[PDB]
PDB file of C-alpha atoms in Angstrom:
ATOM      1  CA  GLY A   4      27.020  87.059 236.731  1.00  0.00           C
ATOM      2  CA  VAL A   5      29.169  84.183 235.492  1.00  0.00           C
ATOM      3  CA  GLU A   6      28.754  80.439 235.076  1.00  0.00           C
ATOM      4  CA  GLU A   7      31.982  79.309 236.742  1.00  0.00           C
ATOM      5  CA  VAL A   8      32.519  75.807 235.327  1.00  0.00           C
ATOM      6  CA  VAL A   9      35.384  73.484 236.273  1.00  0.00           C
ATOM      7  CA  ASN A  10      38.326  73.292 233.886  1.00  0.00           C
ATOM      8  CA  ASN A  11      37.960  69.670 232.794  1.00  0.00           C
ATOM      9  CA  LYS A  12      41.288  69.018 231.073  1.00  0.00           C
ATOM     10  CA  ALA A  13      40.000  65.599 229.968  1.00  0.00           C
ATOM     11  CA  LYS A  14      36.732  66.803 228.421  1.00  0.00           C
ATOM     12  CA  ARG A  15      37.873  66.799 224.794  1.00  0.00           C
ATOM     13  CA  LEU A  16      39.753  63.544 225.413  1.00  0.00           C
ATOM     14  CA  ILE A  17      36.510  61.952 226.626  1.00  0.00           C
ATOM     15  CA  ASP A  18      34.511  63.338 223.699  1.00  0.00           C
ATOM     16  CA  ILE A  19      36.850  62.221 220.915  1.00  0.00           C
ATOM     17  CA  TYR A  20      37.048  58.909 222.771  1.00  0.00           C
ATOM     18  CA  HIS A  21      33.248  58.594 222.701  1.00  0.00           C
ATOM     19  CA  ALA A  22      33.214  59.755 219.090  1.00  0.00           C
ATOM     20  CA  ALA A  23      35.659  57.024 218.107  1.00  0.00           C
ATOM     21  CA  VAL A  24      33.539  54.361 219.808  1.00  0.00           C
ATOM     22  CA  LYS A  25      30.534  55.708 217.906  1.00  0.00           C
ATOM     23  CA  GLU A  26      32.444  55.330 214.645  1.00  0.00           C
ATOM     24  CA  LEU A  27      33.638  51.848 215.634  1.00  0.00           C
ATOM     25  CA  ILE A  28      29.977  50.899 216.082  1.00  0.00           C
ATOM     26  CA  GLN A  29      29.017  52.421 212.730  1.00  0.00           C
ATOM     27  CA  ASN A  30      31.792  50.660 210.799  1.00  0.00           C
ATOM     28  CA  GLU A  31      31.177  47.268 212.459  1.00  0.00           C
ATOM     29  CA  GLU A  32      34.815  47.028 213.624  1.00  0.00           C
ATOM     30  CA  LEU A  33      33.947  46.766 217.318  1.00  0.00           C
ATOM     31  CA  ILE A  34      31.422  43.954 216.855  1.00  0.00           C
ATOM     32  CA  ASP A  35      33.769  42.260 214.380  1.00  0.00           C
ATOM     33  CA  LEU A  36      36.441  42.302 217.087  1.00  0.00           C
ATOM     34  CA  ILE A  37      33.990  40.820 219.591  1.00  0.00           C
ATOM     35  CA  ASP A  38      33.199  38.004 217.151  1.00  0.00           C
ATOM     36  CA  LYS A  39      36.865  37.422 216.277  1.00  0.00           C
ATOM     37  CA  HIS A  40      37.754  36.827 219.930  1.00  0.00           C
ATOM     38  CA  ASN A  41      34.405  35.090 220.447  1.00  0.00           C
ATOM     39  CA  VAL A  42      33.795  37.074 223.635  1.00  0.00           C
ATOM     40  CA  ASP A  43      30.336  37.568 225.128  1.00  0.00           C
ATOM     41  CA  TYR A  44      30.096  41.370 225.203  1.00  0.00           C
ATOM     42  CA  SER A  45      27.472  43.789 223.899  1.00  0.00           C
ATOM     43  CA  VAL A  46      28.178  47.328 222.684  1.00  0.00           C
ATOM     44  CA  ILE A  47      26.431  50.460 223.945  1.00  0.00           C
ATOM     45  CA  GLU A  48      22.850  50.354 222.685  1.00  0.00           C
ATOM     46  CA  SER A  49      22.344  54.057 221.892  1.00  0.00           C
ATOM     47  CA  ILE A  50      24.866  56.169 219.962  1.00  0.00           C
ATOM     48  CA  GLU A  51      22.560  58.886 218.604  1.00  0.00           C
ATOM     49  CA  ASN A  52      23.611  61.460 221.201  1.00  0.00           C
ATOM     50  CA  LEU A  53      27.324  60.615 221.148  1.00  0.00           C
ATOM     51  CA  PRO A  54      29.628  63.126 219.419  1.00  0.00           C
ATOM     52  CA  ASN A  55      30.505  62.732 215.738  1.00  0.00           C
ATOM     53  CA  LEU A  56      34.238  62.167 215.291  1.00  0.00           C
ATOM     54  CA  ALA A  57      34.231  64.335 212.163  1.00  0.00           C
ATOM     55  CA  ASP A  58      33.086  67.383 214.154  1.00  0.00           C
ATOM     56  CA  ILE A  59      35.558  67.142 217.041  1.00  0.00           C
ATOM     57  CA  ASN A  60      38.298  69.766 217.206  1.00  0.00           C
ATOM     58  CA  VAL A  61      41.691  68.107 216.727  1.00  0.00           C
ATOM     59  CA  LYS A  62      43.676  71.322 217.086  1.00  0.00           C
ATOM     60  CA  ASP A  63      46.415  71.584 219.736  1.00  0.00           C
ATOM     61  CA  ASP A  64      45.367  75.123 220.695  1.00  0.00           C
ATOM     62  CA  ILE A  65      43.384  73.938 223.724  1.00  0.00           C
ATOM     63  CA  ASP A  66      45.264  73.749 227.032  1.00  0.00           C
ATOM     64  CA  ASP A  67      44.034  70.234 227.824  1.00  0.00           C
ATOM     65  CA  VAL A  68      45.153  66.600 228.053  1.00  0.00           C
ATOM     66  CA  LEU A  69      44.421  65.830 224.399  1.00  0.00           C
ATOM     67  CA  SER A  70      46.805  68.568 223.251  1.00  0.00           C
ATOM     68  CA  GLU A  71      49.560  66.865 225.254  1.00  0.00           C
ATOM     69  CA  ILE A  72      48.733  63.520 223.641  1.00  0.00           C
ATOM     70  CA  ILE A  73      48.750  65.164 220.205  1.00  0.00           C
ATOM     71  CA  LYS A  74      52.136  66.864 220.607  1.00  0.00           C
ATOM     72  CA  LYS A  75      53.851  63.684 221.825  1.00  0.00           C
ATOM     73  CA  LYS A  76      51.836  61.388 219.534  1.00  0.00           C
ATOM     74  CA  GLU A  77      51.393  59.171 222.594  1.00  0.00           C
ATOM     75  CA  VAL A  78      48.740  58.279 225.166  1.00  0.00           C
ATOM     76  CA  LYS A  79      49.447  56.593 228.508  1.00  0.00           C
ATOM     77  CA  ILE A  80      46.887  53.984 229.594  1.00  0.00           C
ATOM     78  CA  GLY A  81      46.696  52.419 233.045  1.00  0.00           C
ATOM     79  CA  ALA A  82      45.766  48.826 233.831  1.00  0.00           C
ATOM     80  CA  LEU A  83      46.048  46.434 236.783  1.00  0.00           C
ATOM     81  CA  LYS A  84      49.342  44.509 236.808  1.00  0.00           C
ATOM     82  CA  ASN A  85      49.743  40.720 236.737  1.00  0.00           C
ATOM     83  CA  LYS A  86      46.286  40.264 235.215  1.00  0.00           C
ATOM     84  CA  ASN A  87      45.737  37.522 232.646  1.00  0.00           C
ATOM     85  CA  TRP A  88      42.230  36.505 231.564  1.00  0.00           C
ATOM     86  CA  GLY A  89      43.364  34.651 228.455  1.00  0.00           C
ATOM     87  CA  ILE A  90      41.741  35.711 225.199  1.00  0.00           C
ATOM     88  CA  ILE A  91      39.691  38.283 227.112  1.00  0.00           C
ATOM     89  CA  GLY A  92      42.940  40.120 227.815  1.00  0.00           C
ATOM     90  CA  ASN A  93      46.480  39.211 228.848  1.00  0.00           C
ATOM     91  CA  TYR A  94      48.496  41.928 230.601  1.00  0.00           C
ATOM     92  CA  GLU A  95      51.351  39.715 231.813  1.00  0.00           C
ATOM     93  CA  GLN A  96      53.215  41.044 228.768  1.00  0.00           C
ATOM     94  CA  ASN A  97      53.664  44.639 227.582  1.00  0.00           C
ATOM     95  CA  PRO A  98      52.188  45.516 225.131  1.00  0.00           C
ATOM     96  CA  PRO A  99      49.236  43.345 226.243  1.00  0.00           C
ATOM     97  CA  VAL A 100      47.196  41.060 223.977  1.00  0.00           C
ATOM     98  CA  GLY A 101      43.584  39.892 223.823  1.00  0.00           C
ATOM     99  CA  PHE A 102      40.181  41.512 223.424  1.00  0.00           C
ATOM    100  CA  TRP A 103      40.349  44.460 225.824  1.00  0.00           C
ATOM    101  CA  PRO A 104      43.788  45.564 224.605  1.00  0.00           C
ATOM    102  CA  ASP A 105      42.538  45.191 221.017  1.00  0.00           C
ATOM    103  CA  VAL A 106      39.542  47.378 221.898  1.00  0.00           C
ATOM    104  CA  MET A 107      41.812  50.163 223.140  1.00  0.00           C
ATOM    105  CA  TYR A 108      44.006  49.839 220.043  1.00  0.00           C
ATOM    106  CA  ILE A 109      41.198  50.259 217.509  1.00  0.00           C
ATOM    107  CA  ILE A 110      39.756  53.181 219.490  1.00  0.00           C
ATOM    108  CA  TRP A 111      43.047  55.073 219.240  1.00  0.00           C
ATOM    109  CA  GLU A 112      43.653  53.874 215.684  1.00  0.00           C
ATOM    110  CA  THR A 113      40.319  55.504 214.863  1.00  0.00           C
ATOM    111  CA  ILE A 114      41.248  58.626 216.831  1.00  0.00           C
ATOM    112  CA  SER A 115      44.609  58.754 215.060  1.00  0.00           C
ATOM    113  CA  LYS A 116      42.902  58.722 211.653  1.00  0.00           C
ATOM    114  CA  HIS A 117      40.956  61.856 212.621  1.00  0.00           C
ATOM    115  CA  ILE A 118      43.567  63.899 214.485  1.00  0.00           C
ATOM    116  CA  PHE A 119      46.217  62.723 212.044  1.00  0.00           C
ATOM    117  CA  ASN A 120      45.942  60.715 208.807  1.00  0.00           C
ATOM    118  CA  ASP A 121      47.028  57.194 209.796  1.00  0.00           C
ATOM    119  CA  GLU A 122      45.980  54.526 212.307  1.00  0.00           C
ATOM    120  CA  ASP A 123      49.482  54.359 213.829  1.00  0.00           C
ATOM    121  CA  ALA A 124      50.026  58.094 214.343  1.00  0.00           C
ATOM    122  CA  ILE A 125      49.462  57.962 218.104  1.00  0.00           C
ATOM    123  CA  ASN A 126      51.387  55.379 220.112  1.00  0.00           C
ATOM    124  CA  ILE A 127      49.679  53.475 222.934  1.00  0.00           C
ATOM    125  CA  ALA A 128      51.871  53.212 226.039  1.00  0.00           C
ATOM    126  CA  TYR A 129      50.543  50.811 228.676  1.00  0.00           C
ATOM    127  CA  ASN A 130      51.632  51.324 232.288  1.00  0.00           C
ATOM    128  CA  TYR A 131      50.710  48.824 235.003  1.00  0.00           C
ATOM    129  CA  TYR A 132      49.803  49.631 238.619  1.00  0.00           C
ATOM    130  CA  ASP A 133      48.259  47.982 241.679  1.00  0.00           C
ATOM    131  CA  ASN A 134      45.963  50.982 242.152  1.00  0.00           C
ATOM    132  CA  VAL A 135      45.319  52.506 238.729  1.00  0.00           C
ATOM    133  CA  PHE A 136      42.963  55.163 240.104  1.00  0.00           C
ATOM    134  CA  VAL A 137      45.803  56.614 242.194  1.00  0.00           C
ATOM    135  CA  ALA A 138      48.065  56.824 239.145  1.00  0.00           C
ATOM    136  CA  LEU A 139      45.202  58.476 237.276  1.00  0.00           C
ATOM    137  CA  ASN A 140      44.632  61.112 239.961  1.00  0.00           C
ATOM    138  CA  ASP A 141      48.411  61.654 240.022  1.00  0.00           C
ATOM    139  CA  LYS A 142      48.552  62.185 236.240  1.00  0.00           C
ATOM    140  CA  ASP A 143      50.876  59.223 235.678  1.00  0.00           C
ATOM    141  CA  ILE A 144      48.348  58.178 233.032  1.00  0.00           C
ATOM    142  CA  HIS A 145      45.811  59.883 230.773  1.00  0.00           C
ATOM    143  CA  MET A 146      43.420  56.932 230.968  1.00  0.00           C
ATOM    144  CA  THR A 147      42.455  53.670 232.574  1.00  0.00           C
ATOM    145  CA  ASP A 148      41.834  50.635 230.382  1.00  0.00           C
ATOM    146  CA  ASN A 149      38.235  50.160 229.208  1.00  0.00           C
ATOM    147  CA  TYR A 150      37.650  46.879 231.060  1.00  0.00           C
ATOM    148  CA  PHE A 151      37.161  48.529 234.456  1.00  0.00           C
ATOM    149  CA  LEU A 152      33.698  48.138 235.962  1.00  0.00           C
ATOM    150  CA  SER A 153      31.260  51.041 235.736  1.00  0.00           C
ATOM    151  CA  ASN A 154      30.599  50.520 239.456  1.00  0.00           C
ATOM    152  CA  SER A 155      34.252  50.593 240.554  1.00  0.00           C
ATOM    153  CA  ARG A 156      35.369  52.010 243.898  1.00  0.00           C
ATOM    154  CA  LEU A 157      37.186  55.224 242.993  1.00  0.00           C
ATOM    155  CA  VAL A 158      39.460  55.168 246.039  1.00  0.00           C
ATOM    156  CA  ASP A 159      43.121  55.531 246.989  1.00  0.00           C
ATOM    157  CA  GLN A 160      45.131  52.919 248.893  1.00  0.00           C
ATOM    158  CA  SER A 161      43.907  54.276 252.234  1.00  0.00           C
ATOM    159  CA  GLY A 162      40.395  53.470 250.999  1.00  0.00           C
ATOM    160  CA  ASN A 163      39.260  57.092 250.728  1.00  0.00           C
ATOM    161  CA  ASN A 164      37.340  58.418 247.723  1.00  0.00           C
ATOM    162  CA  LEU A 165      39.006  60.257 244.824  1.00  0.00           C
ATOM    163  CA  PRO A 166      36.472  63.003 244.008  1.00  0.00           C
ATOM    164  CA  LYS A 167      38.145  64.433 240.886  1.00  0.00           C
ATOM    165  CA  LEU A 168      37.932  61.269 238.772  1.00  0.00           C
ATOM    166  CA  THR A 169      35.134  60.909 236.215  1.00  0.00           C
ATOM    167  CA  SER A 170      33.880  58.111 233.961  1.00  0.00           C
ATOM    168  CA  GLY A 171      33.117  57.632 230.287  1.00  0.00           C
ATOM    169  CA  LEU A 172      30.028  55.816 229.023  1.00  0.00           C
ATOM    170  CA  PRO A 173      29.631  52.105 229.734  1.00  0.00           C
ATOM    171  CA  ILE A 174      30.600  51.453 226.110  1.00  0.00           C
ATOM    172  CA  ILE A 175      30.767  47.681 226.575  1.00  0.00           C
ATOM    173  CA  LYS A 176      28.663  45.409 228.783  1.00  0.00           C
ATOM    174  CA  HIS A 177      28.334  41.753 229.692  1.00  0.00           C
ATOM    175  CA  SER A 178      25.156  40.159 231.034  1.00  0.00           C
ATOM    176  CA  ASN A 179      24.445  38.171 234.199  1.00  0.00           C
ATOM    177  CA  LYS A 180      22.867  34.737 233.849  1.00  0.00           C
ATOM    178  CA  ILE A 181      20.825  33.049 236.571  1.00  0.00           C
ATOM    179  CA  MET A 182      20.976  29.299 237.104  1.00  0.00           C
ATOM    180  CA  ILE A 183      18.249  27.652 239.164  1.00  0.00           C
ATOM    181  CA  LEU A 184      16.672  24.241 239.764  1.00  0.00           C
ATOM    182  CA  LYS A 185      13.854  23.506 237.305  1.00  0.00           C
ATOM    183  CA  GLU A 186      11.719  22.177 240.151  1.00  0.00           C
ATOM    184  CA  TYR A 187      10.863  25.732 241.255  1.00  0.00           C
ATOM    185  CA  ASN A 188       9.147  26.389 237.913  1.00  0.00           C
ATOM    186  CA  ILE A 189      11.061  29.673 237.581  1.00  0.00           C
ATOM    187  CA  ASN A 190      12.582  30.478 234.178  1.00  0.00           C
ATOM    188  CA  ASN A 191      12.531  34.285 234.119  1.00  0.00           C
ATOM    189  CA  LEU A 192      13.334  37.351 236.207  1.00  0.00           C
ATOM    190  CA  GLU A 193       9.621  38.036 236.730  1.00  0.00           C
ATOM    191  CA  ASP A 194       8.830  34.609 238.198  1.00  0.00           C
ATOM    192  CA  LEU A 195      11.955  34.942 240.342  1.00  0.00           C
ATOM    193  CA  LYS A 196      10.809  38.288 241.765  1.00  0.00           C
ATOM    194  CA  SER A 197       7.473  36.771 242.764  1.00  0.00           C
ATOM    195  CA  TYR A 198       9.213  33.863 244.494  1.00  0.00           C
ATOM    196  CA  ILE A 199      11.660  36.087 246.398  1.00  0.00           C
ATOM    197  CA  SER A 200       8.703  38.284 247.373  1.00  0.00           C
ATOM    198  CA  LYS A 201       6.743  35.302 248.731  1.00  0.00           C
ATOM    199  CA  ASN A 202       9.676  33.698 250.570  1.00  0.00           C
ATOM    200  CA  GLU A 203      12.216  34.793 253.179  1.00  0.00           C
ATOM    201  CA  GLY A 204      15.668  33.752 254.378  1.00  0.00           C
ATOM    202  CA  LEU A 205      16.872  32.886 250.875  1.00  0.00           C
ATOM    203  CA  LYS A 206      20.537  33.219 249.902  1.00  0.00           C
ATOM    204  CA  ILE A 207      22.132  33.926 246.515  1.00  0.00           C
ATOM    205  CA  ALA A 208      25.398  32.450 245.241  1.00  0.00           C
ATOM    206  CA  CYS A 209      27.630  34.463 242.905  1.00  0.00           C
ATOM    207  CA  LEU A 210      30.991  33.830 241.241  1.00  0.00           C
ATOM    208  CA  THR A 211      31.959  37.506 241.444  1.00  0.00           C
ATOM    209  CA  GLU A 212      30.914  40.557 243.454  1.00  0.00           C
ATOM    210  CA  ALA A 213      29.629  42.156 240.249  1.00  0.00           C
ATOM    211  CA  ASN A 214      27.269  39.213 239.701  1.00  0.00           C
ATOM    212  CA  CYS A 215      25.581  39.699 243.078  1.00  0.00           C
ATOM    213  CA  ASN A 216      25.507  43.477 242.609  1.00  0.00           C
ATOM    214  CA  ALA A 217      23.477  43.201 239.403  1.00  0.00           C
ATOM    215  CA  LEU A 218      20.792  41.378 241.401  1.00  0.00           C
ATOM    216  CA  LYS A 219      21.226  43.437 244.575  1.00  0.00           C
ATOM    217  CA  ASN A 220      19.831  46.346 242.557  1.00  0.00           C
ATOM    218  CA  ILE A 221      16.602  44.370 242.228  1.00  0.00           C
ATOM    219  CA  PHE A 222      16.150  42.494 245.496  1.00  0.00           C
ATOM    220  CA  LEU A 223      17.907  44.718 248.053  1.00  0.00           C
ATOM    221  CA  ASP A 224      17.981  43.147 251.544  1.00  0.00           C
ATOM    222  CA  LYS A 225      15.282  40.550 250.786  1.00  0.00           C
ATOM    223  CA  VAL A 226      18.131  38.044 250.456  1.00  0.00           C
ATOM    224  CA  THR A 227      21.746  37.495 251.511  1.00  0.00           C
ATOM    225  CA  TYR A 228      24.540  37.693 248.933  1.00  0.00           C
ATOM    226  CA  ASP A 229      27.486  35.289 248.921  1.00  0.00           C
ATOM    227  CA  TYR A 230      30.246  35.681 246.326  1.00  0.00           C
ATOM    228  CA  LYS A 231      33.370  35.078 248.415  1.00  0.00           C
ATOM    229  CA  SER A 232      32.683  31.355 248.842  1.00  0.00           C
ATOM    230  CA  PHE A 233      32.871  30.543 245.109  1.00  0.00           C
ATOM    231  CA  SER A 234      35.959  30.490 242.883  1.00  0.00           C
ATOM    232  CA  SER A 235      34.645  28.469 239.933  1.00  0.00           C
ATOM    233  CA  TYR A 236      31.581  27.432 237.953  1.00  0.00           C
ATOM    234  CA  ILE A 237      31.783  23.952 239.480  1.00  0.00           C
ATOM    235  CA  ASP A 238      31.807  25.416 243.005  1.00  0.00           C
ATOM    236  CA  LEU A 239      28.937  27.780 242.244  1.00  0.00           C
ATOM    237  CA  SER A 240      26.948  24.974 240.607  1.00  0.00           C
ATOM    238  CA  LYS A 241      27.505  22.539 243.479  1.00  0.00           C
ATOM    239  CA  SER A 242      25.860  25.060 245.810  1.00  0.00           C
ATOM    240  CA  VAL A 243      22.731  25.473 243.675  1.00  0.00           C
ATOM    241  CA  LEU A 244      22.414  21.702 243.230  1.00  0.00           C
ATOM    242  CA  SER A 245      22.967  21.112 246.955  1.00  0.00           C
ATOM    243  CA  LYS A 246      19.945  23.386 247.428  1.00  0.00           C
ATOM    244  CA  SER A 247      21.844  25.691 249.809  1.00  0.00           C
ATOM    245  CA  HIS A 248      21.381  28.717 247.534  1.00  0.00           C
ATOM    246  CA  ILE A 249      18.156  29.357 245.619  1.00  0.00           C
ATOM    247  CA  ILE A 250      20.005  30.645 242.543  1.00  0.00           C
ATOM    248  CA  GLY A 251      23.483  30.988 241.105  1.00  0.00           C
ATOM    249  CA  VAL A 252      24.502  34.207 239.362  1.00  0.00           C
ATOM    250  CA  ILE A 253      27.194  33.865 236.713  1.00  0.00           C
ATOM    251  CA  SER A 254      28.292  35.536 233.469  1.00  0.00           C
ATOM    252  CA  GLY A 255      28.974  32.320 231.550  1.00  0.00           C
ATOM    253  CA  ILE A 256      28.286  28.594 231.280  1.00  0.00           C
ATOM    254  CA  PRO A 257      31.330  26.394 230.453  1.00  0.00           C
ATOM    255  CA  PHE A 258      29.198  23.226 230.228  1.00  0.00           C
ATOM    256  CA  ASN A 259      25.566  22.191 230.775  1.00  0.00           C
ATOM    257  CA  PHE A 260      24.048  20.267 233.662  1.00  0.00           C
ATOM    258  CA  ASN A 261      21.014  18.036 233.084  1.00  0.00           C
ATOM    259  CA  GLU A 262      18.338  19.825 231.032  1.00  0.00           C
ATOM    260  CA  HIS A 263      15.581  18.387 233.214  1.00  0.00           C
ATOM    261  CA  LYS A 264      17.109  19.420 236.546  1.00  0.00           C
ATOM    262  CA  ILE A 265      18.746  22.802 235.941  1.00  0.00           C
ATOM    263  CA  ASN A 266      17.533  26.002 234.323  1.00  0.00           C
ATOM    264  CA  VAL A 267      19.620  28.895 233.011  1.00  0.00           C
ATOM    265  CA  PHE A 268      18.195  32.163 231.680  1.00  0.00           C
ATOM    266  CA  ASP A 269      19.654  35.580 230.869  1.00  0.00           C
ATOM    267  CA  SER A 270      18.350  38.172 233.340  1.00  0.00           C
ATOM    268  CA  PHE A 271      19.665  40.885 231.005  1.00  0.00           C
ATOM    269  CA  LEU A 272      20.839  42.671 234.148  1.00  0.00           C
ATOM    270  CA  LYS A 273      24.047  44.069 232.692  1.00  0.00           C
ATOM    271  CA  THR A 274      27.490  44.830 234.081  1.00  0.00           C
ATOM    272  CA  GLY A 275      29.002  47.826 232.301  1.00  0.00           C
ATOM    273  CA  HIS A 276      32.642  48.568 231.502  1.00  0.00           C
ATOM    274  CA  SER A 277      34.098  52.069 231.155  1.00  0.00           C
ATOM    275  CA  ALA A 278      37.319  54.084 231.112  1.00  0.00           C
ATOM    276  CA  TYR A 279      38.107  56.628 233.835  1.00  0.00           C
ATOM    277  CA  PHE A 280      39.648  60.094 233.532  1.00  0.00           C
ATOM    278  CA  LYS A 281      40.828  62.981 235.716  1.00  0.00           C
ATOM    279  CA  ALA A 282      38.110  65.638 235.466  1.00  0.00           C
ATOM    280  CA  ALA A 283      39.695  68.353 237.627  1.00  0.00           C
ATOM    281  CA  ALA A 284      43.035  69.619 238.935  1.00  0.00           C
TER     282      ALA A 284
END
């Protein structure tokens, strides 16, 4: 009569990781970093149930991933290569710069101050791959970067699922805004739902797949979703103004169109970001 649980070698790594984020939210560092880079992200809303960093075992007695990190004073993080989103995160150079790299740095600086007694105790080693989830399942890395979507396809290059990979909390989110013509008298998600429920054959324009997904959760097959046809705000906007798509879904607004013609409201339908780990051998 035994509870035979999987040996998650990343369990303590995930917990101290979550505990650090909790501390970074308590000490205002994470939100300070968001303000410093002037990026439009929100931190995880509830931290009550997250582990307290002070409690977490930092001993290297456990036969797990964290003990390896501790002995070498180094963690290997995986990120997509040749990515450069400017201030949001530039990975064309190693070590990378920008918000998302800075997020990973302060997390491990915080972890270092608990396992050890200095922010620089543990070195961050970034490795770049085309498929990071393959490298993760192959133990080339201990972690993915935090910027990865919470809804990511955990698949190999063949396109088949990787069942041993797990995810941390969506510690950081960004919201999805909805732009629409004022003439429809719709300025909230509720009025939009009513309209979509009354009408058929409508189509939704999105700048990214994640934008359309946030709304797909709400509307299902009541509408068609187009995100491939748009590569910029100007493209997306042209389509809404041309009246071909009832709304445009987008995470940001570079500049404003006429107040009296266009409406933009925050649906508060969020897109989460999380790190991924290897939860089983």
